[PDB]
Amino acid sequence: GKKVLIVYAHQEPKSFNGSLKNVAVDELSRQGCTVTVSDLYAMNLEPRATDKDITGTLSNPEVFNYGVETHEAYKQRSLASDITDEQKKVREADLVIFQFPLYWFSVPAILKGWMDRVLCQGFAFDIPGFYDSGLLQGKLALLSVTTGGTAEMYTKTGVNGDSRYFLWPLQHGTLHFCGFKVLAPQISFAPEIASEEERKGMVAAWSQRLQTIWKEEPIPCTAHWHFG
Amino acid sequence: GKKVLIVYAHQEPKSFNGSLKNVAVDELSRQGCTVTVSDLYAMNLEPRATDKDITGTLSNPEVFNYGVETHEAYKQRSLASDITDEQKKVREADLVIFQFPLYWFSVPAILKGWMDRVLCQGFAFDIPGFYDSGLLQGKLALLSVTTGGTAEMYTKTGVNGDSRYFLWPLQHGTLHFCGFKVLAPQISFAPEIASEEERKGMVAAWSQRLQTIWKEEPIPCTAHWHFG
Numbered sequence A, B: 001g002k003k004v005l006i007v008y009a010h011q012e013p014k015s016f017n018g019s020l021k022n023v024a025v026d027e028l029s030r031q032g033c034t035v036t037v038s039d040l041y042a043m044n045l046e047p048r049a050t051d052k053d054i055t056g057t058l059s060n061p062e063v064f065n066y067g068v069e070t071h072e073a074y075k076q077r078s079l080a081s082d083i084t085d086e087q088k089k090v091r092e093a094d095l096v097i098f099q100f101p102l103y104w105f106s107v108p109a110i111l112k113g114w115m116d117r118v119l120c121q122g123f124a125f126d127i128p129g130f131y132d133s134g135l136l137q138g139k140l141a142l143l144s145v146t147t148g149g150t151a152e153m154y155t156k157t158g159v160n161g162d163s164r165y166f167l168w169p170l171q172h173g174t175l176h177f178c179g180f181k182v183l184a185p186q187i188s189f190a191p192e193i194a195s196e197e198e199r200k201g202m203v204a205a206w207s208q209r210l211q212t213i214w215k216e217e218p219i220p221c222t223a224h225w226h227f228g
C-alpha cells in the first residue's frame, strides 16, 4: 500500500498541468494507492519565509535568522500549522511528485516557497545529515515539468541548453540534499504550441509511465548524470 | 549619471545581506548614482502569480493562462500597481543588483516571485526579443549572493558542485533571457561560519568592487562559462 503526495502548482484546473495532475490522481487511485494533492494556489500557500513561521519564543528575537529559528522551532514543535501539515504529508509519502510549469528555469515562486518553508533543518536535513544521509532517505521524488520551450531548444546546442542544466538545483540541490532518491523527470515540452494530438500523447505517456512507476529505479543524482 | 536598482531579499536589516545592501547604497550614493531599493520583505511583496495581477476583466476568464493574461495586461496597461511600480524602477535602471541569501541553490521565494511577476512578456522579453535581443538589452545585472557553504565546498569535485552550476537558471535562464548583460557574481561564502575579520574582508571587497563597477566587462553568459 503506497502513499503518494502530489505537490501541484498551477492556477487553472483545465490547464495542461491540471490534466497531468488529474491523470496522475486517476492512475494512482486506480492502482489502489493512497493519494494526496497539495494544490498550492487553491491553498493560497504562504511563500515568504518570515518570522510568522515560528509560533514559539525566538532563539534570538533581536536579530532574526530564518534558518536558525525554524530549525529550533522544528525541534520545539512550534512551526506554523501550514508547514506542520505539509511535513506530515511528506513524512507519510513514499513518492512525492511535483507537478508544475517551468518558470524562469525553475519552479513557480509558490512552489519555491513550499520548498523553502517545508524542508526545514531537523525535518528534511541536518548538518551533518544531507545528500545520501538526508532525513528523507527512503523516499522517492519526481519532477513533472511542463515548458514553453521545445525539446530542440533544450539541447546543448539550442538557445536554452540541456534540460539537465535546469534540473540540477531542484533534483540535486534540493531533493537529493534532503535524502530523496530521484526518479527520472517527466518533461512535457511545449504543450501550448503542440497539436491537440501531440498533447493527448504527452498526457497518455505520463499515464502509461505511472502504470509501472513502482518498478522504476531512481537516477544516480550525480554531477556526471547532469553534466557528463 | 547612472541609475541603480537593488532588489533586496532578506528579513533582517542587521544581517550580513543587510550589511551588503547598505554598503551598496552607501557607495553608489557617494558616487552620485541614482539609487532605488526594493526591500521585498518590508514591501511584503506578493510572490504568487495569480489573476489578481491583472486589474479588471480578463482576456479569457473561463480558462486562466497567467502568461497570456499578463502579456495582454502589459499591453493594455492593466497590470497590478505593485508589478508596474517595479517595472518603472527596472525600465529606468542601468544596473540591477540582486542581493539575497542562497535558498535551495536559488533565490528565496519572495525574490522568485519578483522575477515571475515583474519580468512579464512585452516588458522583459517577447517573441522575438530574448537572450541578446531581450527587451532589457544593454542593462547590467549582478547577483550578490551569500551562502551557507564554504568556497571549497562549491567546487567541481565537491558534493555541492561548482557554484557556477546553480547560477545558470538565474544568470542565463532569467537575466540573459531578458537581455541583461551579466556582471560576474559577487559570492560571499559562508558568512555565518566565517570569522568576524573574514566577514569584514567580504564587506570591504564588495565596497571596493562597487567603486569600479561601471568599468567592468560582463561575463560571456554561455553554457561553457557555467559548465565547461
Ligand SMILES: Cc1cc2nc3c(=O)[nH]c(=O)nc-3n(C[C@H](O)[C@H](O)[C@H](O)COP(=O)(O)OP(=O)(O)OC[C@H]3O[C@@H](n4cnc5c(N)ncnc54)[C@H](O)[C@@H]3O)c2cc1C
Pocket: A010, A014, A015, A016, A017, A018, A019, A100, A101, A102, A103, A104, A105, A106, A146, A147, A148, A149, A191, A192, A196, A199, A200, A203, B049, B065, B066, B067, B115, B116, B117, B173
Ligand atoms: C512567469 C513565467 C515564467 C516562465 N518561464 C519559462 C522558462 O524559463 N522556460 C520555459 O521553457 N518556459 C517558461 N514559461 C512558459 C511555461 O513554462 C509554459 O507556459 C507552461 O509550461 C505551459 O503549461 P500549461 O499547463 O500552462 O499549458 P496550457 O496553456 O494549460 O496548455 C496548452 C493547451 O493544452 C490544452 N490541454 C489541457 N489539457 C489537455 C489534454 N488532456 N489533452 C489535450 N490538450 C490539453 C489546454 O486547453 C491548452 O489550450 C514561463 C511562463 C511564465 C508565466
Ligand SMILES: Cc1cc2nc3c(=O)[nH]c(=O)nc-3n(C[C@H](O)[C@H](O)[C@H](O)COP(=O)(O)OP(=O)(O)OC[C@H]3O[C@@H](n4cnc5c(N)ncnc54)[C@H](O)[C@@H]3O)c2cc1C
Pocket: A065, A066, A067, A115, A116, A117, A173, B010, B014, B015, B016, B017, B018, B019, B100, B101, B102, B103, B104, B105, B106, B146, B147, B148, B149, B191, B192, B196, B199, B200, B203
Ligand atoms: C530555506 C533556506 C535554504 C537554504 N539553502 C541553501 C543552499 O541551497 N545552499 C547554501 O549554501 N546555503 C543555503 N542556506 C543557508 C543560507 O544561504 C545562509 O544562511 C545565508 O546566506 C546567510 O546569510 P545571512 O545574511 O542570513 O547571514 P547572517 O546570519 O545575517 O550573518 C552572519 C554573521 O554576519 C554578521 N554580520 C552582519 N553584518 C556584518 C558586518 N558588516 N561585518 C561583519 N559581520 C557582520 C552577523 O551579525 C552574523 O553574525 C539556506 C538557508 C535557508 C533558510
Ligand SMILES: CCOCc1nc2c(N)nc3ccccc3c2[nH]1
Pocket: A021, A022, A023, A025, A026
Ligand atoms: C466534472 C469533471 O471535471 C473535470 C475533471 N476530470 C478529472 C479527472 N479525470 N480526475 C481528477 C482527479 C482529481 C481531481 C479532479 C479530477 C478531475 N476533474
Ligand SMILES: CCOCc1nc2c(N)nc3ccccc3c2[nH]1
Pocket: A025, A026, A027, A029, A030
Ligand atoms: C470510465 C470513465 O473514465 C474516465 C475517468 N474519469 C475520471 C474522474 N473524473 N475521476 C477519476 C478518479 C479516480 C479514478 C478514475 C477517475 C476517472 N476516470
Ligand SMILES: CCOCc1nc2c(N)nc3ccccc3c2[nH]1
Pocket: A104, A147, A148, A149, A150, A153, A160, B067, B068, B121, B127
Ligand atoms: C508566448 C507565451 O509565453 C510563454 C512563455 N514564457 C516564457 C519564458 N518566461 N521563458 C521561456 C524560455 C524559453 C522558452 C520559452 C519561454 C517562455 N514561453
Ligand SMILES: CCOCc1nc2c(N)nc3ccccc3c2[nH]1
Pocket: A067, A127, A130, B104, B147, B148, B149, B150, B153, B160
Ligand atoms: C553543508 C553542506 O553544503 C553547504 C550548505 N550549507 C548549508 C546551510 N548552512 N544551510 C542550508 C539550509 C538549507 C539547505 C542547504 C543548506 C546548506 N548547504
Ligand SMILES: [Zn+2]
Pocket: A171, A172, A173, A176, A177, A220, A221, A222, A223
Ligand atoms: Zn544528486
Ligand SMILES: [Zn+2]
Pocket: B171, B172, B173, B176, B177, B220, B221, B222, B223
Ligand atoms: Zn547566458
